[PDB]
Amino acid sequence: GSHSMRYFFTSVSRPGRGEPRFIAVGYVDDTQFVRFDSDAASQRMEPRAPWIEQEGPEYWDGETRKVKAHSQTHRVDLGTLRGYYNQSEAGSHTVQRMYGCDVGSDWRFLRGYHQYAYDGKDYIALKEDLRSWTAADMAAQTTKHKWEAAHVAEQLRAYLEGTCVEWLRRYLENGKETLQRTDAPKTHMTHHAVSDHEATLRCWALSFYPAEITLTWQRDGEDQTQDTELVETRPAGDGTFQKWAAVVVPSGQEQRYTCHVQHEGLPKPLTLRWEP
Amino acid sequence: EVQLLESGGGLVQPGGSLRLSCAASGFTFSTYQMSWVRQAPGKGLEWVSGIVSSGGSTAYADSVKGRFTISRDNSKNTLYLQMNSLRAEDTAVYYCAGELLPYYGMDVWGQGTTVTVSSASTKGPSVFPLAPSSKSTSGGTAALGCLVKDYFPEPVTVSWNSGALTSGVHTFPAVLQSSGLYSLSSVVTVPSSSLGTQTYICNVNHKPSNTKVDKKVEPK
Amino acid sequence: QSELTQPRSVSGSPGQSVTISCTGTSRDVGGYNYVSWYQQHPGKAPKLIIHDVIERSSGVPDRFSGSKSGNTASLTISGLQAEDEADYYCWSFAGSYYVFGTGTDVTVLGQPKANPTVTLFPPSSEELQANKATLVCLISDFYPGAVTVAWKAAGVETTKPSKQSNNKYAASSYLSLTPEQWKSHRSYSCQVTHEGNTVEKTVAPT
């Protein structure tokens, strides 16, 4: 199946305090592997997965220097952006940056990303061609002109299509027992009587990896979406995921309904029906 | 033991292209971020481009963006710089240099290779011997040319018996003449007594014109 | 352009100190703590001496120290010695590239005078038979590196002096013009004046 590597950076100004907060995390697929937090005592990039600990001191030193370069860049950006939006020196503001790459089942480059947000909305993003920019508003055109002039896209492209994907492959290999595993969902259905007139059927998928999954309801083999609820896929805390989907049905009509479960660990999708 | 050795430098017309190579030995080249740094004659250092240890991710000075491409191959412990659309202002000594850690500053350096971007044609030198005078021999001491005359571009190499003679030999920095052509001189200081036994051939090499001359300097 | 501004030149006598400033902007010097300094002697590759603003490279004594304040980094060399004479360059990360400063020449004052050895040659018969004539005056082993060469009275070409392996200087002067002008004159001689005193050389017959 497909895989991704992504880095997420959050930069929060703290006026009155105290230097801005800077948090960086890296992910391979749905598995976090490194962190850095400005407020932590180490001031180092830290391992957050067992397989990354195999990397020697050159790596940790290198990543620490680079994440501090990112921190410092973001330190300057908070001021620059406050200037672009004619904002006061006394209000907290949030900058986020995300970049990374996707590979297909043959582990070849599929797509690259590099986007930037300010105060909860898009600021500037690299387009899928990895050659042009989308600026979200008037202020971001300044940055767009700036980055076009400096060939920032070409620089990002070289990393995204090259270094990004090669390290992703390395991680996938080194942490294969974790990252290349498929844990098929453990499934079951529960039944709860709302009253004499209705019952809720809830279809569960537990202890699965990777997070990608689809849960759907049918009634008489027709897709059923009305009176249905689907929660966000959620972390179990042990490296696996959980999800459920529910439908409210008329009393006596439970057997019409089926839950359908699709997941990489399932050769064929599962079909579940209430078993009283 | 640690060594970086550049090659590929030479004469090229404005608008032309050249590829430089840098062969690394005696360190784990595959772990170093590599750069090219150039230095125009009499001028300061200018960083040109850099590439991460694994290859792929690169960066360039504004002055060369879109024209130069840096690359490496770790299997051959070699770094490359492909230079296109060359300009007169790209004339310089190009050094290969490396750093283990990002943002440290390069601490392993090569010796440089010379790139000359010019529309002027290459010219091989003439070589003349400068005989030791019986007027220049006071006592146990004497001197001999050459010269070399009248070449382009730099360099130019002078030996006396295949690099065996290391002490006693002075080859001087070239004069750049009004014509646009260089000249230099190589003098050896020899005992006037031994103006017969030990033989000294002026062995001159000018690579860009494919010139080799061996001129024997004899008491006239 | 984006350059890192340094002074052209600084100097001091032995035992004294110089400081070399290096100013950039928040894009570089003021933005990060990744300033380095390099020492480059004539005819050699640069050597890294300071990295990460303040850290000395292996072999570098504490008398070389780095610092920065705002947009300006500084290198101070205390206990100045003759072999400290070199060009010094600062260097910084600048986000999307690296950049060197403009370079500062460090002069160590009070070094002893060294007298030029002079060696002069006449044109070769070979050259003369090729209908050309070049007189060659070679000037070696001198300090300081300023000489002035005088020949005759056209066709004079003289090098700027440059440092030798032994830290003395060399220069050369070449005198051209035609075998008939050479024929001809009773004698030709080459200067050379260094620090108030002159040294000939010589040469006449054909």
Partner: peptide, 9 residues
């Protein structure tokens, strides 16, 4: 492995 080149906005 992180990007080493990061341009300010």
């Amino acid at each position: 492995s992180l990007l080493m080149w990061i341009t300010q906005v």
